[PDB]
Enzyme design. Structure first.
Site, PDB file in Angstrom:
ATOM      1  CG  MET A  39      -1.783  -1.205   1.322  1.00  0.00           C
ATOM      2  SD  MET A  39      -2.943  -0.976   2.723  1.00  0.00           S
ATOM      3  CE  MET A  39      -4.327  -0.371   1.734  1.00  0.00           C
ATOM      4  CG  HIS A  43       7.774   0.266   6.977  1.00  0.00           C
ATOM      5  ND1 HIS A  43       7.983  -1.094   7.064  1.00  0.00           N
ATOM      6  CD2 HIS A  43       6.448   0.454   7.158  1.00  0.00           C
ATOM      7  CE1 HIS A  43       6.835  -1.702   7.305  1.00  0.00           C
ATOM      8  NE2 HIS A  43       5.891  -0.783   7.386  1.00  0.00           N
ATOM      9  CG  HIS A  46       6.627  -2.099   2.782  1.00  0.00           C
ATOM     10  ND1 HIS A  46       6.510  -1.093   3.727  1.00  0.00           N
ATOM     11  CD2 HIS A  46       5.364  -2.541   2.536  1.00  0.00           C
ATOM     12  CE1 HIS A  46       5.229  -0.932   4.033  1.00  0.00           C
ATOM     13  NE2 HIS A  46       4.513  -1.780   3.300  1.00  0.00           N
ATOM     14  CG  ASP A  76      10.792   8.418   0.511  1.00  0.00           C
ATOM     15  OD1 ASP A  76      11.886   8.933   0.872  1.00  0.00           O
ATOM     16  OD2 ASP A  76      10.473   7.261   0.859  1.00  0.00           O
ATOM     17  CG  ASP A  77       6.154   4.937  -1.227  1.00  0.00           C
ATOM     18  OD1 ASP A  77       6.757   4.889  -0.125  1.00  0.00           O
ATOM     19  OD2 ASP A  77       4.918   5.027  -1.312  1.00  0.00           O
ATOM     20  CD  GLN A  80      11.884   3.830   1.238  1.00  0.00           C
ATOM     21  OE1 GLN A  80      12.224   2.910   2.006  1.00  0.00           O
ATOM     22  NE2 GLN A  80      10.724   4.492   1.350  1.00  0.00           N
ATOM     23  CE  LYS A 148       3.327  -5.033  12.304  1.00  0.00           C
ATOM     24  NZ  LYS A 148       2.117  -5.397  13.002  1.00  0.00           N
ATOM     25  CB  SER A 184       3.592  -1.073  12.182  1.00  0.00           C
ATOM     26  OG  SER A 184       2.357  -0.574  11.771  1.00  0.00           O
ATOM     27  CB  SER A 185       3.114   2.946   8.236  1.00  0.00           C
ATOM     28  OG  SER A 185       2.036   2.060   8.011  1.00  0.00           O
ATOM     29  NE  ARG A 186      -2.833   0.989  11.673  1.00  0.00           N
ATOM     30  CZ  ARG A 186      -3.977   0.334  11.840  1.00  0.00           C
ATOM     31  NH1 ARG A 186      -4.191  -0.364  12.956  1.00  0.00           N
ATOM     32  NH2 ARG A 186      -4.906   0.372  10.891  1.00  0.00           N
TER      33      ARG A 186
HETATM   34  O1  LIG Z   1       3.011  -1.473   7.882  1.00  0.00           O
HETATM   35  C1  LIG Z   1       2.457  -2.571   8.362  1.00  0.00           C
HETATM   36  O2  LIG Z   1       1.801  -2.686   9.492  1.00  0.00           O
HETATM   37  C2  LIG Z   1       2.413  -3.871   7.474  1.00  0.00           C
HETATM   38  C3  LIG Z   1       3.667  -4.133   6.494  1.00  0.00           C
HETATM   39  C4  LIG Z   1       4.761  -4.847   7.017  1.00  0.00           C
HETATM   40  C5  LIG Z   1       5.403  -4.428   8.211  1.00  0.00           C
HETATM   41  C6  LIG Z   1       6.506  -5.122   8.720  1.00  0.00           C
HETATM   42  C7  LIG Z   1       6.987  -6.201   8.043  1.00  0.00           C
HETATM   43  C8  LIG Z   1       6.414  -6.617   6.869  1.00  0.00           C
HETATM   44  C9  LIG Z   1       5.324  -5.942   6.340  1.00  0.00           C
HETATM   45  O3  LIG Z   1       7.084  -7.740   6.378  1.00  0.00           O
HETATM   46  C10 LIG Z   1       8.336  -7.756   7.137  1.00  0.00           C
HETATM   47  O4  LIG Z   1       8.037  -7.004   8.380  1.00  0.00           O
END
Ligand SMILES: O=C(O)CCc1ccc2c(c1)OCO2
Ligand SMILES: O=C(O)CCc1ccc2c(c1)OCO2
Lengths: 276, 290
Positions: A39, A43, A46, A76-77, A80, A148, A184-186
């Protein structure tokens, strides 16, 4: 005429039939097409998916970026992705994914109503519909998802089995901050008190994984103790299940999953557990 | 191609993995794979589908036979479906078909119902009104067959027209890479649409059953005079017919969707003759349009 593809550069396609034609053309040249659906707002979690996809010999990496309104740093995406050596980004508009609006959809089995499906009863229908379409668009040999979002991963496995899809699903281990916190982006939303408290999810699960020599109850009790030691952590569930999220067998392999609210931010984590 | 494939002969595979490997292997060597999905009880309507597939150059034809439990409501509908599998295979040999795909229920549904296809709103109308899970079952089994066989083209009759439209929706909405070919309804000499359900007409019902196709072709010609005239002509002929109970007769836009009829319509009828439910439908051009 097949759309242009420049080997070793980031090639950006927004048209489904474009990425479809380029994928089909690359497969005939003997590349193995790997899809990493995202999405956006990328980070290090990903990047682990991407890195995993990149090491398949002959791999060409398709990263899809799509905010499924049914379940962003564009420049930025893409930067990366370029820095990782990714060759295809698929970045379709909502209208291109849904030219006829919402019509035929995937209906998950009853696992989609449990756990995460508690507060979002339609979330997984949204995910599986969009993933089924990406699969049919790109037609990859392997598709990569993080552990995750464990329940999402199991539901994809079920999509693939049930609809007889001819792709390999690869689950990639959670990437973690230095104290254990699942990426997590959270995480960016947490204030410093929440961020220090948030480490209890991973601490609970690692404790449970090691308590597990003493059986299932000692693993759950240890996890619960660690969560109970953290302030402002509103646990929505903490459940031990089998690997496919049915009920945990008496001995053998399992998964322990947790989710909790910290202020307005919802966090998830899960871990493998071997009983006894 | 992983199992044995003998060309110029009918090869029968029950295992999904078997047909999948052979199909893949064929396509890789340049043959184009044609899928004809059926519930067996093959008649000349199905042979037109086979023939249409055979005439695609370099085609290899896969006919699936599978009486799909998920599209049947409870009752004895599933048990009562005609099963003539010796005739079916004889017809496929006589037509020169190289692959029959005959899966078991266990092979297709090893986990029972779990992930399924949910059709759009069209599936709640017409045939789907009192059979609200019918088209979910159809689209689900069709999805699985397309994924197993991965054909270049898939062939369905216009006879079950609402089904054909829902298939084209499935294919568009899930971005499936197959081409859907609709084949014109095959009719008996008097106009009766071919169907596996015709065998349940006794002599009186068989005679009365001509009313459906007569009503439809009467409306198609009356249609120069407008929609009401097309509809009233169909209705008169149905009304003149002994022991024909109409369930619906509806003139819709061609896609059957959330759009008003313009120049091109489809007139659809369903009616019961005793316990046998018959379907038929026809293309309608309104006024100027012919
Ligand atoms: O941003 C998020 O909550 C979901 C995406 C995500 C986050 C960490 C991960 C991953 C995928 O695969 C390796 O560790
Ligand atoms: O038996 C049934 O009711 C459905 C199968 C069928 C019937 C008539 C057809 C056809 C397919 O393709 C051309 O005409």
């Amino acid at each position: 005429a097949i759309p242009a593809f420049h080997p070793g550069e980031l090639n950006v396609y927004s048209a489904p039939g474009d990425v479809a034609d380029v994928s089909r053309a690359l497969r005939l040249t003997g590349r193995r097409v790997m899809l990493v659906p995202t999405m956006g707002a990328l980070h290090e979690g990903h990047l682990a998916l991407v890195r995993a996809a990149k090491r398949v010999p002959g791999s060409v990496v398709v990263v899809s970026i799509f905010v499924n309104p049914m379940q962003r740093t564009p420049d930025d995406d893409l930067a990366q992705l370029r820095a990782e050596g990714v060759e295809i980004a698929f970045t379709p508009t909502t209208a291109a994914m849904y030219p006829d609006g919402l019509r035929t959809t995937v209906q998950p089995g009853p696992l989609a109503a449990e756990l995460e499906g508690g507060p979002r009863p339609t979330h997984f229908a949204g995910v599986l519909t969009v993933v089924l379409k990406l699969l049919q668009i790109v037609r990859p040999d392997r598709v990569f998802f993080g552990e995750k979002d464990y329940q999402q991963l199991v539901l994809i496995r079920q999509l693939v089995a049930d609809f007889n899809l001819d792709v390999a699903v690869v689950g990639v281990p959670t990437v973690r901050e230095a104290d254990g916190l699942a990426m997590s982006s959270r995480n960016r939303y947490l204030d410093p008190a929440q961020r220090a408290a948030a480490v209890a999810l991973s601490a609970a699960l690692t404790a449970a994984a090691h308590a597990a020599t003493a059986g299932a109850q000692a693993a759950l009790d240890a996890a619960r103790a660690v969560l109970d030691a953290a302030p402002g952590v509103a646990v929505d569930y903490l459940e031990l299940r089998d690997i496919g999220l049915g009920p945990m067998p008496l001995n053998g392999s399992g998964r322990l999953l947790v989710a909790a609210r910290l202020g307005t931010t919802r966090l998830l984590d899960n871990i493998a557990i071997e009983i006894g």
